[PDB]
Protein backbone atom coordinates (compact mmCIF):
# COMPACT_ATOMS: atom_id res chain seq x y z
CA UNK A 1 0.00 0.00 0.00
CA UNK A 2 1.46 3.30 -1.20
CA UNK A 3 0.35 6.91 -0.86
CA UNK A 4 1.45 10.40 -1.85
CA UNK A 5 4.64 11.80 -0.34
CA UNK A 6 3.79 13.52 2.93
CA UNK A 7 2.39 17.03 2.62
CA UNK A 8 5.01 18.05 5.17
CA UNK A 9 7.80 17.22 2.69
CA UNK A 10 6.07 19.33 0.09
CA UNK A 11 6.01 22.25 2.53
CA UNK A 12 9.54 21.69 3.77
CA UNK A 13 10.73 21.76 0.17
CA UNK A 14 8.95 25.03 -0.45
CA UNK A 15 10.20 26.58 2.79
CA UNK A 16 13.79 25.56 2.11
CA UNK A 17 13.52 26.91 -1.42
CA UNK A 18 12.20 30.32 -0.41
CA UNK A 19 14.97 30.49 2.19
CA UNK A 20 17.72 29.57 -0.28
CA UNK A 21 16.43 32.18 -2.76
CA UNK A 22 16.35 34.83 -0.03
CA UNK A 23 20.14 34.52 0.05
CA UNK A 24 20.94 33.64 -3.56
CA UNK A 25 19.33 36.79 -4.97
CA UNK A 26 22.04 38.70 -3.07
CA UNK A 27 24.34 37.10 -5.64
CA UNK A 28 21.84 37.52 -8.49
CA UNK A 29 20.98 33.80 -8.48
CA UNK A 30 17.72 31.89 -8.21
CA UNK A 31 16.72 28.24 -7.99
CA UNK A 32 13.39 26.90 -9.22
CA UNK A 33 13.42 23.24 -8.21
CA UNK A 34 15.34 22.38 -5.05
CA UNK A 35 15.73 18.80 -6.20
CA UNK A 36 17.48 19.86 -9.44
CA UNK A 37 19.02 23.30 -9.18
CA UNK A 38 21.61 22.28 -6.60
CA UNK A 39 22.99 19.23 -8.42
CA UNK A 40 25.72 21.05 -10.35
CA UNK A 41 27.13 22.51 -7.12
CA UNK A 42 27.40 26.09 -8.36
CA UNK A 43 24.39 27.27 -6.36
CA UNK A 44 25.50 25.52 -3.17
CA UNK A 45 28.83 27.23 -3.48
CA UNK A 46 27.22 30.62 -4.09
CA UNK A 47 24.83 30.08 -1.20
CA UNK A 48 27.77 29.41 1.12
CA UNK A 49 29.66 32.41 -0.24
CA UNK A 50 26.69 34.62 0.63
CA UNK A 51 26.11 33.07 4.04
CA UNK A 52 29.68 33.16 5.34
CA UNK A 53 30.98 36.01 3.21
CA UNK A 54 33.89 33.70 2.35
CA UNK A 55 35.27 33.04 -1.14
CA UNK A 56 35.17 29.47 -2.49
CA UNK A 57 36.90 27.73 -5.45
CA UNK A 58 34.85 26.41 -8.39
CA UNK A 59 35.67 23.57 -10.78
CA UNK A 60 34.20 25.00 -13.96
CA UNK A 61 33.29 21.99 -16.08
CA UNK A 62 30.33 20.52 -17.95
CA UNK A 63 30.26 16.81 -17.15
CA UNK A 64 29.53 14.72 -14.09
CA UNK A 65 33.16 14.49 -12.93
CA UNK A 66 32.98 18.29 -12.52
CA UNK A 67 29.59 18.32 -10.83
CA UNK A 68 30.94 15.94 -8.19
CA UNK A 69 34.02 18.12 -7.84
CA UNK A 70 31.91 21.27 -7.27
CA UNK A 71 29.58 19.62 -4.79
CA UNK A 72 32.59 18.23 -2.90
CA UNK A 73 33.87 21.78 -2.58
CA UNK A 74 30.65 22.75 -0.83
CA UNK A 75 30.64 19.70 1.40
CA UNK A 76 34.28 20.14 2.33
CA UNK A 77 33.72 23.78 3.25
CA UNK A 78 31.05 22.67 5.71
CA UNK A 79 33.09 19.78 7.08
CA UNK A 80 36.08 22.03 7.74
CA UNK A 81 33.71 24.47 9.48
CA UNK A 82 33.08 21.51 11.82
CA UNK A 83 29.63 20.89 10.31
CA UNK A 84 28.83 17.20 10.59
CA UNK A 85 27.43 15.87 7.32
CA UNK A 86 26.66 12.27 8.12
CA UNK A 87 25.59 9.72 5.52
CA UNK A 88 25.78 12.29 2.72
CA UNK A 89 28.06 11.88 -0.30
CA UNK A 90 28.71 14.36 -3.10
CA UNK A 91 27.11 12.09 -5.71
CA UNK A 92 23.96 12.06 -3.58
CA UNK A 93 23.57 15.80 -4.14
CA UNK A 94 24.86 15.80 -7.73
CA UNK A 95 22.49 13.01 -8.71
CA UNK A 96 19.64 14.64 -6.79
CA UNK A 97 18.50 12.36 -3.98
CA UNK A 98 15.64 14.57 -2.68
CA UNK A 99 15.66 13.55 0.98
CA UNK A 100 19.43 13.81 1.32
CA UNK A 101 19.25 17.15 -0.49
CA UNK A 102 16.64 18.38 1.93
CA UNK A 103 18.94 17.22 4.73
CA UNK A 104 21.93 19.10 3.37
CA UNK A 105 19.94 22.32 3.24
CA UNK A 106 18.55 21.77 6.70
CA UNK A 107 22.10 21.32 7.98
CA UNK A 108 23.10 24.58 6.29
CA UNK A 109 20.15 26.40 7.83
CA UNK A 110 20.92 25.03 11.29
CA UNK A 111 24.54 26.06 11.17
CA UNK A 112 24.11 29.58 9.75
CA UNK A 113 20.69 30.72 10.91
CA UNK A 114 19.38 28.64 13.80
CA UNK A 115 22.50 27.98 15.84
CA UNK A 116 23.45 31.58 16.68
CA UNK A 117 20.45 32.03 19.00
CA UNK A 118 21.01 33.84 22.32
CA UNK A 119 18.59 33.71 25.23
CA UNK A 120 18.93 35.06 28.76
CA UNK A 121 19.54 32.30 31.24
CA UNK A 122 20.52 29.62 28.74
CA UNK A 123 22.95 26.69 28.84
CA UNK A 124 25.55 25.43 26.38
CA UNK A 125 23.95 21.99 26.82
CA UNK A 126 20.80 23.44 25.28
CA UNK A 127 20.47 22.79 21.55
CA UNK A 128 19.93 25.69 19.15
CA UNK A 129 16.36 24.40 18.91
CA UNK A 130 15.84 24.41 22.70
CA UNK A 131 17.10 27.99 22.82
CA UNK A 132 14.69 29.05 20.06
CA UNK A 133 11.79 27.48 21.93
CA UNK A 134 12.86 29.20 25.13
CA UNK A 135 13.03 32.46 23.23
CA UNK A 136 9.54 31.96 21.78
CA UNK A 137 8.19 31.21 25.22
CA UNK A 138 9.85 34.31 26.68
CA UNK A 139 8.38 36.47 23.90
CA UNK A 140 4.79 35.34 24.38
CA UNK A 141 5.01 35.35 28.17
CA UNK A 142 2.19 37.32 29.73
CA UNK A 143 -0.08 37.17 26.67
CA UNK A 144 -3.34 35.68 27.93
CA UNK A 145 -3.95 32.07 26.91
CA UNK A 146 -0.84 31.98 24.77
CA UNK A 147 1.50 29.07 25.23
CA UNK A 148 4.39 27.63 23.26
CA UNK A 149 5.05 23.94 23.83
CA UNK A 150 6.47 22.89 20.47
CA UNK A 151 7.41 24.00 16.97
CA UNK A 152 4.41 22.31 15.39
CA UNK A 153 0.83 22.38 16.73
CA UNK A 154 1.58 25.39 18.98
CA UNK A 155 1.82 27.61 15.91
CA UNK A 156 -1.26 26.38 14.07
CA UNK A 157 -3.64 29.24 14.91
CA UNK A 158 -1.22 32.06 14.11
CA UNK A 159 -1.57 33.64 17.51
CA UNK A 160 2.03 33.10 18.66
CA UNK A 161 3.30 34.69 15.43
CA UNK A 162 1.24 37.80 16.06
CA UNK A 163 2.19 38.06 19.73
CA UNK A 164 5.88 37.76 18.91
CA UNK A 165 5.66 40.63 16.45
CA UNK A 166 3.56 42.55 18.96
CA UNK A 167 6.14 42.28 21.74
CA UNK A 168 8.66 43.82 19.35
CA UNK A 169 6.41 46.54 17.90
CA UNK A 170 3.00 46.89 19.58
CA UNK A 171 1.87 49.35 16.92
CA UNK A 172 1.88 46.72 14.19
CA UNK A 173 -0.57 44.30 15.81
CA UNK A 174 -4.07 44.59 17.26
CA UNK A 175 -3.97 41.60 19.65
CA UNK A 176 -7.59 42.17 20.58
CA UNK A 177 -8.60 41.27 17.02
CA UNK A 178 -6.04 38.45 16.87
CA UNK A 179 -8.06 36.77 19.62
CA UNK A 180 -11.17 36.97 17.45
CA UNK A 181 -9.75 35.99 14.04
CA UNK A 182 -9.52 32.66 12.25
CA UNK A 183 -6.29 30.67 12.12
CA UNK A 184 -5.77 31.66 8.47
CA UNK A 185 -6.58 35.36 8.93
CA UNK A 186 -4.07 35.50 11.80
CA UNK A 187 -1.37 33.57 9.97
CA UNK A 188 -1.70 35.76 6.89
CA UNK A 189 -1.72 38.94 8.98
CA UNK A 190 1.46 37.90 10.81
CA UNK A 191 3.39 36.84 7.70
CA UNK A 192 2.25 39.99 5.88
CA UNK A 193 3.26 42.37 8.68
CA UNK A 194 6.58 40.66 9.33
CA UNK A 195 7.36 40.97 5.62
CA UNK A 196 6.42 44.59 4.95
CA UNK A 197 7.42 45.97 8.36
CA UNK A 198 10.32 43.73 9.46
CA UNK A 199 11.70 42.53 6.13
CA UNK A 200 11.05 38.91 7.03
CA UNK A 201 10.72 36.79 3.88
CA UNK A 202 7.43 34.87 3.65
CA UNK A 203 8.71 31.31 3.89
CA UNK A 204 5.33 29.86 4.90
CA UNK A 205 1.87 30.02 3.36
CA UNK A 206 -1.01 30.22 5.85
CA UNK A 207 -2.74 27.10 4.42
CA UNK A 208 0.49 25.16 5.05
CA UNK A 209 0.56 26.04 8.73
CA UNK A 210 -3.14 25.74 9.58
CA UNK A 211 -3.01 21.96 9.95
CA UNK A 212 -3.01 19.51 12.86
CA UNK A 213 0.74 18.83 12.53
CA UNK A 214 2.82 21.50 10.71
CA UNK A 215 6.33 20.77 9.40
CA UNK A 216 8.60 21.42 12.41
CA UNK A 217 11.70 22.39 10.43
CA UNK A 218 9.70 24.87 8.38
CA UNK A 219 8.25 26.51 11.49
CA UNK A 220 11.72 26.59 13.08
CA UNK A 221 13.28 28.23 10.05
CA UNK A 222 10.61 30.92 10.03
CA UNK A 223 10.57 31.54 13.79
CA UNK A 224 14.36 31.77 13.67
CA UNK A 225 14.10 34.42 10.99
CA UNK A 226 11.77 36.40 13.25
CA UNK A 227 14.44 36.28 15.92
CA UNK A 228 16.96 37.48 13.30
CA UNK A 229 14.74 40.50 12.58
CA UNK A 230 14.94 41.42 16.28
CA UNK A 231 17.63 42.80 18.63
Amino acid sequence: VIRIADERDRVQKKTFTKWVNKHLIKAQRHISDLYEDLRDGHNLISLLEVLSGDSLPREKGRMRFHKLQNVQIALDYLRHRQVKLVNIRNDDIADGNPKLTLGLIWTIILHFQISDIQVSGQSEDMTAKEKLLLWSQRMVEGYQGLRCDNFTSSWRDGRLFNAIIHRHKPLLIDMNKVYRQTNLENLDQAFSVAERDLGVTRLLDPEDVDVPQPDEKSIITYVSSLYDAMP
Partner: protein, 200 residues
Amino acid sequence: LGAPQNPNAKAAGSRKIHFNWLPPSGKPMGYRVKYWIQGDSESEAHLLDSKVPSVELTNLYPYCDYEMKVCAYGAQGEGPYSSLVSCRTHQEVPSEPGRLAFNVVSSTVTQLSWAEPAETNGEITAYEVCYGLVNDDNRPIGPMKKVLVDNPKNRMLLIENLRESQPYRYTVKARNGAGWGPEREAIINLATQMSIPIIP
Protein backbone atom coordinates in the same frame (compact mmCIF):
# COMPACT_ATOMS: atom_id res chain seq x y z
CA LEU B 1 40.10 22.53 -53.33
CA GLY B 2 36.91 24.19 -52.18
CA ALA B 3 34.93 23.18 -49.11
CA PRO B 4 32.89 19.97 -49.10
CA GLN B 5 29.26 21.05 -49.56
CA ASN B 6 25.91 19.82 -48.23
CA PRO B 7 27.17 18.49 -44.84
CA ASN B 8 24.71 15.86 -43.66
CA ALA B 9 24.60 13.91 -40.39
CA LYS B 10 22.16 11.48 -38.80
CA ALA B 11 22.21 9.18 -35.78
CA ALA B 12 22.94 5.56 -36.63
CA GLY B 13 22.31 2.96 -33.94
CA SER B 14 24.32 2.77 -30.72
CA ARG B 15 26.81 5.50 -29.88
CA LYS B 16 27.52 6.41 -33.53
CA ILE B 17 26.68 9.00 -36.18
CA HIS B 18 26.65 8.67 -39.98
CA PHE B 19 28.21 11.77 -41.51
CA ASN B 20 28.42 12.47 -45.24
CA TRP B 21 28.88 15.37 -47.63
CA LEU B 22 29.18 16.44 -51.25
CA PRO B 23 32.78 16.23 -52.60
CA PRO B 24 34.32 19.54 -53.75
CA SER B 25 34.99 20.08 -57.44
CA GLY B 26 38.15 18.29 -58.50
CA LYS B 27 39.75 15.04 -57.37
CA PRO B 28 40.32 15.11 -53.57
CA MET B 29 42.58 12.41 -52.12
CA GLY B 30 40.46 12.34 -48.98
CA TYR B 31 38.75 14.25 -46.19
CA ARG B 32 39.37 15.20 -42.57
CA VAL B 33 36.43 15.22 -40.18
CA LYS B 34 36.59 17.35 -37.05
CA TYR B 35 33.90 16.48 -34.50
CA TRP B 36 33.25 17.39 -30.87
CA ILE B 37 30.55 17.66 -28.24
CA GLN B 38 28.39 20.77 -28.61
CA GLY B 39 29.52 23.19 -25.91
CA ASP B 40 33.13 22.01 -25.91
CA SER B 41 35.88 23.97 -27.64
CA GLU B 42 37.16 22.95 -31.08
CA SER B 43 40.16 22.09 -28.89
CA GLU B 44 38.57 18.99 -27.39
CA ALA B 45 37.78 17.99 -30.95
CA HIS B 46 38.55 14.62 -32.48
CA LEU B 47 39.98 14.18 -35.97
CA LEU B 48 38.98 11.40 -38.36
CA ASP B 49 40.44 10.60 -41.78
CA SER B 50 38.41 9.33 -44.74
CA LYS B 51 39.12 8.45 -48.36
CA VAL B 52 35.40 8.58 -49.20
CA PRO B 53 32.76 11.37 -48.87
CA SER B 54 31.32 9.84 -45.70
CA VAL B 55 32.37 8.65 -42.25
CA GLU B 56 31.09 6.79 -39.21
CA LEU B 57 31.65 8.57 -35.92
CA THR B 58 31.82 5.76 -33.33
CA ASN B 59 32.42 5.50 -29.57
CA LEU B 60 30.21 8.46 -28.80
CA TYR B 61 28.16 9.25 -25.68
CA PRO B 62 24.46 8.28 -25.83
CA TYR B 63 21.82 11.02 -26.17
CA CYS B 64 24.49 13.63 -26.80
CA ASP B 65 24.65 16.61 -29.18
CA TYR B 66 27.67 16.64 -31.48
CA GLU B 67 29.07 19.32 -33.79
CA MET B 68 31.07 18.40 -36.88
CA LYS B 69 32.64 19.82 -40.01
CA VAL B 70 34.77 18.33 -42.75
CA CYS B 71 37.48 19.52 -45.09
CA ALA B 72 39.03 18.00 -48.20
CA TYR B 73 42.73 17.57 -48.98
CA GLY B 74 44.80 16.62 -52.01
CA ALA B 75 47.59 17.66 -54.35
CA GLN B 76 47.63 21.26 -53.10
CA GLY B 77 47.11 20.55 -49.40
CA GLU B 78 44.00 21.12 -47.28
CA GLY B 79 41.00 23.17 -48.36
CA PRO B 80 38.47 25.15 -46.30
CA TYR B 81 36.13 23.41 -43.88
CA SER B 82 32.47 22.83 -44.62
CA SER B 83 29.79 24.63 -42.65
CA LEU B 84 28.97 23.16 -39.22
CA VAL B 85 26.40 20.39 -38.86
CA SER B 86 24.87 19.36 -35.51
CA CYS B 87 23.47 15.94 -34.65
CA ARG B 88 22.33 14.05 -31.55
CA THR B 89 23.05 10.37 -30.86
CA HIS B 90 20.36 7.82 -30.03
CA GLN B 91 19.60 6.92 -26.44
CA GLU B 92 20.70 4.03 -24.24
CA VAL B 93 18.92 2.55 -21.24
CA PRO B 94 19.91 4.38 -18.03
CA SER B 95 22.28 3.16 -15.32
CA GLU B 96 21.12 2.13 -11.84
CA PRO B 97 19.26 4.80 -9.86
CA GLY B 98 21.26 6.17 -6.93
CA ARG B 99 21.56 4.20 -3.70
CA LEU B 100 18.25 3.92 -1.84
CA ALA B 101 17.59 6.08 1.21
CA PHE B 102 14.96 5.24 3.83
CA ASN B 103 13.12 7.58 6.21
CA VAL B 104 11.50 5.37 8.83
CA VAL B 105 8.13 6.92 9.66
CA SER B 106 7.00 3.99 11.80
CA SER B 107 7.27 0.20 12.20
CA THR B 108 4.91 -0.11 9.23
CA VAL B 109 5.67 3.02 7.19
CA THR B 110 8.73 4.28 5.33
CA GLN B 111 9.75 6.97 2.88
CA LEU B 112 11.90 5.52 0.13
CA SER B 113 13.96 7.92 -1.98
CA TRP B 114 16.63 7.56 -4.66
CA ALA B 115 18.81 9.76 -6.83
CA GLU B 116 18.66 9.93 -10.64
CA PRO B 117 20.93 7.46 -12.47
CA ALA B 118 24.50 8.74 -12.76
CA GLU B 119 24.24 8.09 -16.50
CA THR B 120 20.74 8.75 -17.81
CA ASN B 121 21.85 8.14 -21.41
CA GLY B 122 18.66 9.89 -22.42
CA GLU B 123 15.55 11.58 -21.08
CA ILE B 124 14.25 9.59 -18.12
CA THR B 125 10.46 9.26 -18.25
CA ALA B 126 9.56 6.85 -15.44
CA TYR B 127 10.79 4.87 -12.43
CA GLU B 128 9.57 1.49 -11.26
CA VAL B 129 9.67 0.51 -7.60
CA CYS B 130 9.32 -3.10 -6.54
CA TYR B 131 9.12 -4.24 -2.92
CA GLY B 132 8.21 -7.48 -1.16
CA LEU B 133 8.78 -9.82 1.80
CA VAL B 134 12.08 -11.71 1.96
CA ASN B 135 13.13 -14.48 4.36
CA ASP B 136 16.26 -15.09 6.41
CA ASP B 137 18.52 -15.68 3.40
CA ASN B 138 17.21 -12.45 1.89
CA ARG B 139 15.32 -13.90 -1.08
CA PRO B 140 11.69 -12.97 -1.90
CA ILE B 141 9.08 -15.42 -0.62
CA GLY B 142 6.29 -14.13 -2.83
CA PRO B 143 5.27 -11.74 -5.61
CA MET B 144 6.78 -8.28 -5.41
CA LYS B 145 4.46 -5.29 -5.45
CA LYS B 146 5.23 -3.14 -8.48
CA VAL B 147 4.81 0.63 -8.58
CA LEU B 148 5.07 2.84 -11.62
CA VAL B 149 6.17 6.40 -11.07
CA ASP B 150 5.12 8.23 -14.24
CA ASN B 151 6.68 11.50 -13.09
CA PRO B 152 10.49 11.13 -13.32
CA LYS B 153 10.99 14.26 -11.21
CA ASN B 154 9.42 12.46 -8.26
CA ARG B 155 12.17 10.32 -6.72
CA MET B 156 10.47 9.73 -3.39
CA LEU B 157 7.81 7.16 -2.45
CA LEU B 158 5.75 6.80 0.71
CA ILE B 159 5.12 3.10 1.38
CA GLU B 160 2.82 2.30 4.29
CA ASN B 161 1.11 -0.79 5.72
CA LEU B 162 4.29 -2.91 5.85
CA ARG B 163 4.66 -5.77 8.33
CA GLU B 164 6.38 -5.20 11.66
CA SER B 165 9.85 -6.67 12.11
CA GLN B 166 9.66 -8.08 8.59
CA PRO B 167 12.52 -7.73 6.07
CA TYR B 168 11.56 -6.18 2.74
CA ARG B 169 13.59 -5.98 -0.46
CA TYR B 170 13.26 -2.77 -2.49
CA THR B 171 14.34 -2.09 -6.07
CA VAL B 172 14.18 1.04 -8.18
CA LYS B 173 14.89 1.16 -11.90
CA ALA B 174 14.68 3.96 -14.47
CA ARG B 175 13.21 4.12 -17.97
CA ASN B 176 13.97 6.38 -20.91
CA GLY B 177 13.48 6.35 -24.67
CA ALA B 178 15.58 3.20 -25.02
CA GLY B 179 13.73 1.26 -22.33
CA TRP B 180 14.51 0.14 -18.78
CA GLY B 181 17.88 0.13 -17.04
CA PRO B 182 19.26 -2.13 -14.26
CA GLU B 183 17.88 -2.13 -10.71
CA ARG B 184 19.20 -0.58 -7.50
CA GLU B 185 18.54 -2.86 -4.53
CA ALA B 186 18.29 -2.67 -0.72
CA ILE B 187 17.02 -5.00 2.01
CA ILE B 188 15.52 -3.15 4.97
CA ASN B 189 13.84 -4.17 8.20
CA LEU B 190 12.09 -1.21 9.88
CA ALA B 191 11.97 -2.81 13.33
CA THR B 192 15.74 -3.30 13.23
CA GLN B 193 16.72 0.35 12.87
CA MET B 194 14.02 9.02 13.98
CA SER B 195 13.81 11.34 10.95
CA ILE B 196 17.35 10.74 9.68
CA PRO B 197 17.65 8.62 6.52
CA ILE B 198 19.09 5.10 6.60
CA ILE B 199 21.16 3.72 3.72
CA PRO B 200 22.09 0.00 3.40
